[PDB]
Design a binder for this molecule. Structure first.
Ligand SMILES: Cc1cc(C)nc(SCC(=O)Nc2cccc(COc3ccc(NC(=O)c4cnn(C)c4)c(I)c3)c2)n1
Ligand SMILES: [Zn+2]
Length: 290
């Protein structure tokens, strides 16, 4: 087995060994809650529009004929600031140290890009608000977030300047496929991965969650999350996480806030001062633009 013990300390020693060259991060809403971006799937965080069923506001067919409810929600959920968390900057340190193979994110908040991850390092599995596109097949004019934000706050349904068709944020609506990029990167990246770092996701959304089963059998998998996640469901179960059985050999659960877990791991790696300096610098820069 590649980990000398099933602890954060064991993962840190593995990461500092010659065996650990290529890290894949799988991240969800839990890496952005400390940035003041609620998880839209969280129960703790629209009747006038007459939605056939609640989830119709995120369904492609309904949105194309009735986009008003979605854009009204977009203005209400629009964050007041885009300040990446310690977890986001930890992934930037992975990139800087030549350890980041890829970051697969289920988030659409663009914090990975703001923290310094480039398009090549990223797989936005559920799409993103970073870019928007006219929905007309013969046009597909691309619009930046600055353009889409103005339309969202003005309460003007965004229309293409070339053909007057609806302009849709590049998020994956229900009824749309995950991007081709997701499947092609998964097919290549999971041949090469030395460590799977799973942070701030309950691994309940498919097919994203199934990525953990694409890791080679030897590849250590560290979960940094408020709750244990990724174990086979005893009912549905009739390559899940095994943290706590006598057969456990490679899966580690660090239970707490993603920021606290990434700080703890950075500290073990001798990166704590580097991470503090990077976060304080970027936070200062963002605060001065805000
Ligand atoms: C407006 C804005 C801009 C920026 C840059 N950040 C933010 S962060 C705050 C926020 O949550 N905003 C927000 C607003 C309106 C709607 C939504 C809903 O977003 C999404 C996204 C993807 C998905 N897709 C999946 O999950 C998924 C999976 N399989 N399939 C097939 C789809 C869904 I469903 C909903 C979010 N907000
Ligand atoms: Zn157009």
């Amino acid at each position: 087995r590649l980990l000398d013990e099933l602890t954060l300390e064991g993962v840190a020693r593995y990461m500092q060994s010659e065996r650990c060259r290529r890290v894949i991060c799988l991240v969800g809403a839990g890496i952005s809650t400390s940035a003041g971006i609620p998880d839209f799937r969280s129960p703790s965080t629209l009747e006038k529009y007459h939605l056939p069923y609640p989830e119709a506001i995120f369904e492609i067919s309904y949105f194309k004929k009735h986009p008003e409810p979605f854009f009204a929600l977009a203005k209400e959920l629009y964050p007041g600031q885009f300040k990446p968390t310690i977890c986001h900057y930890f992934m930037r340190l992975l990139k800087d140290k030549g350890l980041l193979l890829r970051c697969y994110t289920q988030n659409i908040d663009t914090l990975e890009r703001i923290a310094g991850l480039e398009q090549e390092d990223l797989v936005e599995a559920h799409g993103t608000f970073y870019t928007s596109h006219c929905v007309s097949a013969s046009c597909r004019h691309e619009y930046p977030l600055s353009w889409m934000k103005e339309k969202i706050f003005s309460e003007v349904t965004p229309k293409c300047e070339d053909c007057q068709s609806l302009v849709k944020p590049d998020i994956v609506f229900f009824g749309e496929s995950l991007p081709a990029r997701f499947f092609s990167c998964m097919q290549s990246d999971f041949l090469k991965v030395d460590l799977l770092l799973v942070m701030g996701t309950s691994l309940q959304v498919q097919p994203f969650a199934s990525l953990i089963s694409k890791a080679p059998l030897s590849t250590p998998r560290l979960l940094i999350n408020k709750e244990k996640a990724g174990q086979s469901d005893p009912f549905l179960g009739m390559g899940g996480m095994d943290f706590d059985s006598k057969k456990a050999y490679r899966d580690v659960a660090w239970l707490g806030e993603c920021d606290q877990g990434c700080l703890a791991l950075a500290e073990l790696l001798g990166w704590k001062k580097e991470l503090e300096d990077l976060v304080r610098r970027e936070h200062a820069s963002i605060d001065a633009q805000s």
